[PDB]
């Protein structure tokens, strides 16, 4: 069901947030701390925004949730060097996310 799928999405989001590597993605990026972010990234997304959307019932499917998670990971890849701490963190998050999404297909 929509409800059971979204329950599991909420769990994935919590589990991502529980990782040490989630630190860059917890809150929206502030371009006053991070130079050029607004110029480079057209569509910002972060875990707090996803959590608020879940709480308000703004996702009507697990696919809508997935689109936001992917935006987080894609923005990270786009903006940061792959060998940077934040670059590495995004790769960790994406790998973990896919490892949990797999449960839909077991």
């Amino acid at each position: 069901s929509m409800h059971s799928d979204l329950t599991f999405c909420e769990i994935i989001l919590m589990e991502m947030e529980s990782h040490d590597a989630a630190w860059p993605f917890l809150e929206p990026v502030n371009p006053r701390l991070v130079s050029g972010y607004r110029r480079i990234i057209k569509n910002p997304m972060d875990f707090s925004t996803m959590r608020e959307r879940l709480l308000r019932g703004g996702y009507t499917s697990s696919e809508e949730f997935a689109a936001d998670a992917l935006l987080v990971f894609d923005n990270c890849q786009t903006f940061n060097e792959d060998d940077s701490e934040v670059g590495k963190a995004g790769h960790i998050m994406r790998r973990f996310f896919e490892s949990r999404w797999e449960e839909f297909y077991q």
Binding site: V34, S35, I40, F79, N80, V86
Partner: peptide, 9 residues
């Protein structure tokens, strides 16, 4: 070190 954009950007 601080978060920053790829040098090429």
């Amino acid at each position: 070190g601080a978060k920053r954009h790829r040098k090429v950007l």
